[model samples]
Target: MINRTDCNENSYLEIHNNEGRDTLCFANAGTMPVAIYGVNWVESGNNVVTLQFQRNLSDPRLETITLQKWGSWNPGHIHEILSIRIY
Candidate 1:
């Protein structure tokens, strides 16, 4: 798990594929008058994964975002992860 400090008012998270070639997942939860983005990885690889938060719409405030990783036995579901908290 990774944590980021000094994030912009418009903060969001992004998940990259195992190969880090493409974006596998992306989401945003609007908290603290700002929209938060969330992302996760289901596969394992040396691929480069990145998470970014920036000002999108308007307003800029301080908020905390948490990111976590998990494993699943199901082959159909490779990337099984979740994110929460943005206020």
Candidate 2:
């Protein structure tokens, strides 16, 4: 497992492996002021997994917001995932 920190749109995270294969288990913490984009999964073969995100869109401040997960991975349940503020 690994952890990183970012502020606003300038913050981002990346993971890489040097061995046979690497897997990342992620969880978010803290308060989110801006909308979280979405989770992305990249890989192939038996090295498959699902990554997803969930957000509250009922607020009038941002009438409509969308979270997208890119790459070749799919997550089972996104609602039970954790969120972290990047601002």
Provide the global lDDT of candidate 2 against the true structure.
Answer: 0.28
lDDT string for model 1 (1-87, tens) is 234322233223434433344443323333222223322233212222222333232444323223433221112212323332322
Candidate 2 lDDT over residue span 5-65, tens digit each: 3212321322222221333322233233222233233222222222223433343232222
The true-versus-predicted C-alpha distance at residue 61 of model 1, in Å, is: 34
Q: What is the C-alpha lDDT of each candidate?
A: 0.30, 0.28
* Top candidate, metric TM-score: 1
Off by over 4 Å in 2: 3-46, 59-87
